[PDB]
Amino acid sequence: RPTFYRQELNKTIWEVPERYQNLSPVGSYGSVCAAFDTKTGLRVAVKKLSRPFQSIIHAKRTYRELRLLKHMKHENVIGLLDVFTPARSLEEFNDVYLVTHLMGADLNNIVKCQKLTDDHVQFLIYQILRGLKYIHSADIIHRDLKPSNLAVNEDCELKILDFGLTRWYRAPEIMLNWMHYNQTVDIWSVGCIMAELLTGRTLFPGTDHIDQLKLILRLVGTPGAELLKKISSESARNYIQSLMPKMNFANVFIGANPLAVDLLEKMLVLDSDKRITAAQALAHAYFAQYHDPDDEPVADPYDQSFESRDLLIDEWKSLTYDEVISFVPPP
């Protein structure tokens, strides 16, 4: 057991092992500081969970995040370097700290509203898809993928943050509270991101909810007959039928690699059942210089039975505690 020190950060006391020095807030169910791990020589992010066992909902959220982070072992997905608490027993267990790599920026920082070269977009989107293939293979859907959730370092390596829990990158069915989401909700977001890296501007910068849907339909067309067949509500279909051709992406993204355009066309399809998958997209010719079918790994199956369980606050706390106890750092 290491020895801890206390300091006041972001309006609370953070108590962490002495190995982590120079804690500096990076921003804000938890607050994150940059630190330096003097024991490993690595720059790390230390996230202190907020009120982790205050209620059944917080307790299950805490357990969710820890289980997810402990499962994810992939170069393009945030992983756990350490988890700690200053508690010596279950009885005293009230705080949880999660440590990951400090990547040093998110994807907005790497764009600064300027277009990237095609080669650079290839690499960035390749990495996002490789991470998503991995996440999706565990039966986990991100649902809110966006630039602020993509951490990137200076060598341009990317990790996906905040999976399994601005609307500009949201799939239209998420905005419409459709339910029964497909994993390709995430592919929608990837298309929005990729469009923006290529062009320098937001693809669908809606001013509000309905404006966002209006912008989307302008690009991709009103729903076709095969899609309208899958909608029950007559009122909803009546609304849609009272309203648009699908634009040619080759004439929308002028100057882009035609293979980029064709991949965008396969991603930004309104019908989620017809969107390209992550695995399929990794085999698209756009990624020929980076694709290796033997190094795009899948996850071990992830036991998600806890998600349907309704347990007591002390049970969730106990389960989390055990997970903290059993944690073994990665090599």
Ligand SMILES: O=C(NCCN1CCOCC1)c1ccc2c(c1)C(=O)c1ccc(Nc3ccc(F)c(NC(=O)c4ccccc4)c3)cc1OC2
């Ligand atoms: O170093 C950074 N800023 C320093 C100051 N800047 C200011 C100006 O110039 C220099 C850069 C910096 C700026 C932005 C970012 C990071 C680091 C980063 O590495 C970074 C690393 C981790 C992180 N979030 C985080 C940390 C620990 C966690 F456990 C989680 N949890 C999850 O991802 C999660 C996963 C599944 C479900 C729920 C949560 C997430 C968020 C991050 O945000 C991007």
Ligand SMILES: CCCCCCCCO[C@@H]1O[C@H](CO)[C@@H](O)[C@H](O)[C@H]1O
């Ligand atoms: C007016 C905007 C129309 C949006 C239509 C979005 C269609 C999304 O696509 C749909 O997603 C559902 C999964 O969530 C699937 O069950 C449906 O099979 C699929 O067609």
Ligand SMILES: CCCCCCCCO[C@@H]1O[C@H](CO)[C@@H](O)[C@H](O)[C@H]1O
């Ligand atoms: C003015 C209303 C326009 C709304 C357009 C799309 C709303 C789609 O709505 C969805 O249809 C699904 C398939 O029937 C249902 O399973 C979902 O419950 C429902 O949310």
